[PDB]
């Protein structure tokens, strides 16, 4: 525990499609990090034919924000099978609320950065459109992108302005090409 506490922590916050997963597998290999997608988790769950996973099917075929409790404790778990090893960890898709924020500070420790990917709305839209006519996931349909989007401008734009008081993120232009996003985030992993 107090291992995981005081581990860099890195949180991935960006908007459906905007290249999170993409980035966070390329800081992986370069610096080695540890990569925690709270929708992998989730999707995990569902996979175990678990009850709970069958709710939380339904809530991301929704497109809808699985409850706070649920996605943080799963993190933790997996944040401690991994931390006898970590040069650090990278939180992607987690928070995506303010109070999700704010319980992962009280339970687990601060984030030393917040990296930003930053994406145009209708890049995303297309994005998600192209992953979903070929082979994309069951919430990559337009009906459910809409949802997604909105949750994201709503609920989750207000986690950047919160820590940006105080001065840890950076703000990632996703729209570049793959490898010239991470050179930008680069420079922002270099400053840990
Ligand atoms: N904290 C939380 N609390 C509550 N509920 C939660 C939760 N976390 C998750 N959930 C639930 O789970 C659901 C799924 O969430 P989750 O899976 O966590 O997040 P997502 O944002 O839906 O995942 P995506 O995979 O769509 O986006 P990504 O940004 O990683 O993009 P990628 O790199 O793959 O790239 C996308 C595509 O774009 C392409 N691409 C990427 N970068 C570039 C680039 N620079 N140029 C060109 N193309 C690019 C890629 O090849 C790819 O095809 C949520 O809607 C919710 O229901």
Do not use: W
């Not at 991994?82 to 009280?106: M, N, T, W």
């Not at 030393?112 to 459109?129: C, F, H, N, P, Q």
């Not at 001065?167 to 050179?183: T, Y």
């Amino acid at each position: 525990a107090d291992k995981i506490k005081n581990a860099k922590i890195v949180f991935v916050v960006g908007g459906p499609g905007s290249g999170k997963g993409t980035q966070c597998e390329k800081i992986v290999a370069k610096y080695g990090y540890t990569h925690l997608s709270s929708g992998d988790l989730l999707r995990a769950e569902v996979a175990s034919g678990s009850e709970r996973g069958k709710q939380l099917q339904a809530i991301m075929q929704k497109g809808e924000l699985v409850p706070l409790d649920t996605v943080l404790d799963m993190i933790k778990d997996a944040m401690i099978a991994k931390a006898d090893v970590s040069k650090g960890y990278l939180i992607d898709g987690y928070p995506r609320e303010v109070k999700q924020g704010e319980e992962f500070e009280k339970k687990i420790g601060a984030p030393a950065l917040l990296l930003y990917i930053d994406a145009k709305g209708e890049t995303m839209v297309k994005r998600l459109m192209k992953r979903g006519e070929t082979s994309g996931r069951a919430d990559d349909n337009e009906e459910t992108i809409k949802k997604r989007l909105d949750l994201y401008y709503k609920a989750t734009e207000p986690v950047i302005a919160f820590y940006e008081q105080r001065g840890i993120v950076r703000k990632i232009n996703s729209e570049l090409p793959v490898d010239e996003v991470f050179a930008i985030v680069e420079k922002a992993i270099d400053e840990l």
